[PDB]
Design a protein around this nucleic acid. Structure first.
Lengths: 793, 793
DNA sequence: TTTTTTGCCCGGG
DNA sequence: CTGTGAGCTTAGCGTTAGAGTAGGTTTTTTTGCCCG
């Protein structure tokens, strides 16, 4: 009964919470992983097990042990905000009865407390690195007592997760420089990489690996009728029941085959367009079955009506394809949907009301959504062969906790190029290699630059000897010394780059000693990338030369998120959208460096930049086009009009809203630390406006009149009007309120002013077909009184 | 028995203060004035006495009575800040022992708490008309218990003082409107106008006027050798005691002829330069008399040992002329002297240490200095015939209240001037007339527009029928009913509509006609205390700033915060053109956006300032304000004042008039933008207002001894390390260098793409000091440790 | 021609 | 708008310059940081 969790010294509350939330006994692999000789003595640990096992239970027990016994702050680092929230509630629900002050840093969420009062901080990678920089800047690094790290195999990505090398390297360096019984214990989960012994020995960790699964997975590939296992054993020839030309690979039959068993099918797709198309086809066959009408389909239509009606509450309305599919238990789930459509369709699949769910990779990662069967539609995604890590992560969802006894998965392929499928079933992950590693013919990399930047700006390792001592702690150094048995000259080409771009200063004494500029501290405090800072700071300088206070577009530009290919841009539509801009906004285009000749060149084709002019002219226009969308969001333009106007979609929009609201807070901290306090107040005073939710005190008014919420607010800020009060107000009183609600804009033409600049000031005061307040104050009374005449009935 | 103040039943604490401050018995005209039929009952009072009488003792006893008999608040309205401050401290030391809360609103000094807390507010006219607008807007007029008006004859001054008509009209109108036992007793004091009974009848006041003064006045004209009485009766022929080179009028002998009896002289000159000439001349002859030693002048030089050193102790230094004259008890006093130099010279003259004082009109008004003999150098002043009021204000200074028995005045006149000279003695004040009156061929006057504006915007008399009911309360109407305005009232609202200060509302409450409401430009104009004639420029300057604001430097914020003046100085258009051309492109950019132009600057050198049309008339106002902005920048740029006087040609009196006015304009134009709803521009202006303070703290002034420590560099050192100069000598040069580099805002040494090299040269030249920071950081320690070995002894 | 994913901290009392 | 003496080179003798004065909040009180 060594596996019975009650023996392990858990507090009874947590034991019963595990009895509530989970299972009473650990798996045997978990009992081994906790009992590597020094792990319970505080040795660092790296381990790997399938995600269907109780992967985090080992870490959670190690978290609780250290925080009960050593009573020091712990940091839990997770790859995504959604996982960070899900795990925060789990950890709170598990530990709160013990009083462990769990909170976390993720998205816009913050503890609303100073860190030194928490016990567990749950973080995304971005905010875990940011917090450690501030612990180093505050020199409070002594507070941190543990770090826990999921998906430690992310070290090899240029986009994200290299921060996880820098983060652990900073911890190791400060510890090693102090040490040369652990100050910080590191626990890492790494999904069974090869050369995982290298990651373990780099961290001085114990290593545990198992392939144990609560349920087995039959990975297989389909070509033609033939079904092969991982060994290429032909196990079945498939029958294309419900044979139709509607799918030449008979995807419907593999789904229907499992629908006939009353089990749930998960179906990964190359694209949102293909995913949307494929869910329509499947639903039409369940329509075709039921309207022509072997096992029948069970539809549970009483619940599908509740789900499909609940989706009607959402501001954008129910998707015109979900209207076709959801009545049959067919849905699609991808990041082209809004954030709530995702949450509702996830919950409806977790309970099995939806039984077929077509999806992109958004169900591979970020949400744990297990299924009984996983179908993967092609080995090629876009123009490229599927990442074998994505393949493993997709098929890893085929297991369930006893809801079936096995998992199954099917790669679908054609008979040509079949080996490019089998290469996934027989392959394995590439060895992980740190992004710090230069190519022999190449300049230093942006992650090495940022690694070197952070230490200096925090005042750690200001000497080049200390920079070489830091670099010896990297996973690159551990990887190099293993593989070889040049980095000393890669530091120099970074420090020069940090000098030539003014992030650091050199001071004499024998040698040189380096310090942050304000452009250093600003880059670090905003936790921007240096490569992005040279675009943001170049935009900020050109505003100091002439900031248009007349309107929001110029300051939206400065706070507009930096994205690469946030959409495809139709440069001809952008050219038209710029050409028709109002005068006081076309003046913003000229001042930010948008140019007729560049848009025309981008209409006439496409450009790949070859000069520092061309490399930033793109970065100007791409940022400006993104601001034109943000301008329409704060102007409350309907999203259905934005999508048609810009080619955007309602998922891209909602992520833009969430990103802009954070950029305004970074670039306030950026300008605050460049000392540009006249720009900080303009940005901080605008951070208060760059938000998009309904002010609930107004809600019962905007519920009815569909007026712009500022009109509702002034009709609330004056006289506290409900709709039943607006029906009583005098049309002349409302006209005076509507006239004196706005910030002033004179109607006259000034001397030496173009009338095309005056017309905008008089137009901005109009309320709609050109309703002046004289007229609008009547129509608003007519609307209010005619509605009230139909609401008290 | 009615003359002895003890018999009037004062509270004994105030009797003891009057026994301390002056004569214990009232003058007979004061007892008669206080015993008009109803002035003690509460009826308004208008009275006149020569200013050397106890003119204000009447109003002081009326104040004290009503403030004790009623818990209502007195408002004491005085023509200048100097007399206002003096009256405040007098009234404080008089009433504080009774517990009456006396404070005031003057010249950028304000009470510790809002008017609700006070019993008496002593204020200038413009801060009186300010406060009265706040009492009307707050609807707190019930608090106003009494108004006491000095210099009520100023109602006819078109430049300033007509506000005393608007103020009293609005008090009378709100009294009439609300009441129609006196609600607000107005006590008015005036010089003896011909039509003073009309001013009394307008206020329904009782009238008293008398010629009694304790020291009788002899007026005379010296024409040629010959001295005439007021009747042109010859009294004496004067031959000069002193032979003097080029003293064709014997003015030096006219001074000396009473210096021989130890009596002081006050000499009024047409100009500052003519004062300095005459002070030098008179000093030369008193030196010559003593060097050749007529009776030798007694100089009391032991007392001048303080005064003349105290002028050397002053940061102005002892003026190049004052070095020569002050040892001999000759001084000059005019608006070009720094305010502390005036106070020292006033005190020495009041003590009798100075025995001849030349002055411009600055001692005719706003300063009480008596002298036995007043001499007026010409009947023509500055190309004008001298004003008969100004002459009587000058001559009124003759006679010293208790020291002397007779006052003498000599007007000096040429034989050609005789007709104009005699007319100043035989003449008398012109009848007062309100400036609200149109000339039959002229446009409606700005005094009426500001009158009609304030009622509307304050929420009073919002209908034309009420405007006619207001107009009937003016002193204009009282002037006319004794015997055209019908078009003036309607033309004003036509003007205030065409210039968007008010809103025409066609209210539906009846067919009777329109209602008028404030715009935001109305409220801003009123609550800033600006004239409508100024806010047509202050708006167009501020409106053209919104189109593109240079945050890169202070100059564009200062161009919004400078005072507005006509002929603050002469502008040498060549040394402006040569000085605009010399600006950095950081600031030559601002000149483009502000609207300064070569086609105007290079035309003023070659033509005349006469602007024929509104385009040119504003174009001139752009440039004159920009020139004032350069001077005001240099004052905050720590340019030494001796340089500024060379660079622009202003003087150390105008500079203080600019420093005092600009600090207030930073407040007014905040509130102007605040009411316009331009809350972004308000926040830039409100932050910048924190920098417009010019007094360095003496706690920092220790560091200011160091040659390299600009007040910024001293302050940031004191902020960084609270350093004594001993500690700056103790400091490490590298630590100092780090402090010097950390203190500044970041500016890039790099050039950016699509800059031009001048734009980056200005960032580099702005980062250095008049030395690179490393270089200065050595010299500063070598300087500090050179000081310390000299400072320890 | 086409996928999903992430940074900041304040203001009350 | 005026008037006349203030200013220029060699200096004996040309003609431009020149008065003084004023507007606005927030402010105190209980102080600071956790906890809004």
């Amino acid at each position: 009964d060594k596996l019975l969790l009650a023996n392990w010294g858990l507090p009874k509350a947590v034991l019963e919470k595990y009895h509530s939330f989970g299972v009473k006994k650990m798996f045997e692999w978990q009992a081994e992983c906790l009992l590597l000789g020094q792990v319970l003595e505080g040795k660092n640990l790296v381990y790997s097990a399938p995600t269907s096992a109780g992967k985090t239970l080992v870490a959670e027990l190690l978290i609780l042990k250290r925080v009960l016994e050593m009573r020091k702050k712990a940091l839990f680092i997770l790859p995504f905000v959604s996982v960070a929230k899900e795990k925060k509630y789990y950890l709170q629900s598990l530990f709160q009865e013990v009083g462990i002050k769990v909170d976390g840093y993720m998205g816009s969420t913050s503890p609303s407390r100073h860190f030194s009062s928490l016990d567990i901080a749950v973080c995304t990678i971005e905010r875990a690195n940011g917090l450690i920089n501030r612990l180093i800047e505050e020199n409070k690094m002594d507070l941190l007592g543990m770090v826990v790290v999921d998906e430690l195999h992310m070290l090899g990505d240029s986009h994200r997760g290299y921060l996880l090398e820098l983060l652990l390297t900073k911890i190791c360096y400060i510890t090693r420089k102090s040490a040369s019984s652990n100050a910080v214990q590191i626990v890492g989960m790494s999904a069974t990489l090869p050369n995982l012994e290298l990651v373990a020995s780099w961290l001085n960790a114990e290593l545990y690996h198992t392939d144990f699964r609560p349920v087995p997975l039959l990975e297989s590939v389909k070509v033609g009728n033939s079904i092969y296992d991982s060994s290429m054993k032909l196990v079945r020839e498939f029958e294309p029941m419900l044979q139709v030309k509607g799918d030449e690979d008979h995807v419907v039959s593999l789904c229907y085959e499992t629908i006939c068993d009353n089990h749930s099918v998960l179906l990964f797709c190359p694209s949102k367009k293909w995913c949307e198309k494929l869910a329509d086809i499947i639903a039409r066959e369940f329509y075709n079955l039921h309207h022509q009408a072997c096992p029948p389909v069970i539809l549970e239509q009483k619940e599908l009506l509740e789900v499909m009606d609940q989706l009607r509450r959402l501001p954008s309305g129910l998707d015109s394809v979900l209207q076709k599919t959801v009545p049959w238990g067919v849905a699609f789930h991808h990041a082209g949907l809004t954030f709530e459509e995702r949450d509702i369709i996830e919950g409806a699949f977790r309970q099995g009301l939806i039984r077929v769910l077509a999806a992109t990779s958004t169900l591979s990662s970020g949400v744990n959504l297990p299924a009984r069967r996983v179908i993967i539609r092609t080995p090629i995604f876009g123009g490229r062969p599927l990442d074998i890590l994505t393949y493993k992560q997709m098929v890893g969802r085929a297991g369930r906790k006893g809801v079936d006894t096995v998992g199954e998965s099917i790669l679908i392929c054609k008979n040509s190029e079949k080996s490019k499928g089998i290469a996934l079933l027989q392959g394995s992950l590439k060895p992980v290699r740190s992004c710090l590693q230069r190519r022999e013919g190449e300049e230093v990399t942006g992650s090495m630059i940022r690694a070197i930047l952070e230490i200096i700006v925090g005042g750690v390792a200001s000497t080049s000897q200390d920079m070489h001592t830091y670099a010896a702690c990297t996973f690159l150094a551990a990887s190099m010394k293993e593989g070889k048995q040049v980095q000393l000259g890669a530091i120099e080409a970074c420090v020069m780059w940090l000098l030539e771009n003014e992030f650091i200063q050199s001071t004499e004494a024998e040698g040189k000693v380096y310090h942050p500029t304000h452009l250093g501290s600003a880059t670090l405090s905003s936790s921007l990338s240096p490569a992005d800072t040279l675009d943001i700071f170049a935009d900020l300088q050109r505003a100091m030369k002439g900031f248009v206070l007349e309107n929001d577009l110029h300051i939206l530009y400065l706070v507009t998120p930096m994205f690469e290919d946030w959409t495809t841009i139709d440069w001809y539509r952008f050219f038209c959208l710029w050409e028709k801009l109002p005068t006081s906004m076309k003046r913003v285009a000229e001042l930010v460096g948008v140019e007729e000749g560049f848009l025309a060149r981008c209409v006439k084709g496409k450009v790949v930049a070859r000069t520092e002019r061309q490399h930033r002219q793109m970065a100007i226009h791409k940022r400006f086009f993104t601001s034109l969308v943000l301008l329409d969001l704060i102007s409350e333009v309907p999203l259905r009009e934005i999508n048609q106007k810009y080619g955007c979609n309602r998922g891209q929009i909602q992520s833009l809203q969430q990103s802009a609201a954070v950029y305004a807070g970074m670039i306030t901290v950026f300008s605050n630390r460049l000392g540009w306090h006249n720009m900080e107040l303009l940005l901080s005073q605008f951070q208060k406006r760059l938000t998009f939710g309904i002010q609930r005190e107004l809600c019962d008014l905007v519920r009815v009149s569909l007026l712009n919420a500022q009109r509702a607010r002034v009709l609330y800020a004056s006289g506290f009007h409900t709709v039943a009060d607006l029906a009583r107000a005098n049309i002349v009183e409302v006209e005076v309120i509507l006239k004196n609600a706005v910030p002033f804009k004179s109607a006259r033409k000034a001397v030496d002013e173009e009338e095309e600049a005056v017309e905008e000031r008089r137009n901005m005061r109009t309320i709609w077909k050109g309703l002046t307040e004289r007229e609008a104050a009547a129509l608003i009374v007519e609307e209010a009184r005619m509605i009230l005449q139909q609401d008290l009935v």
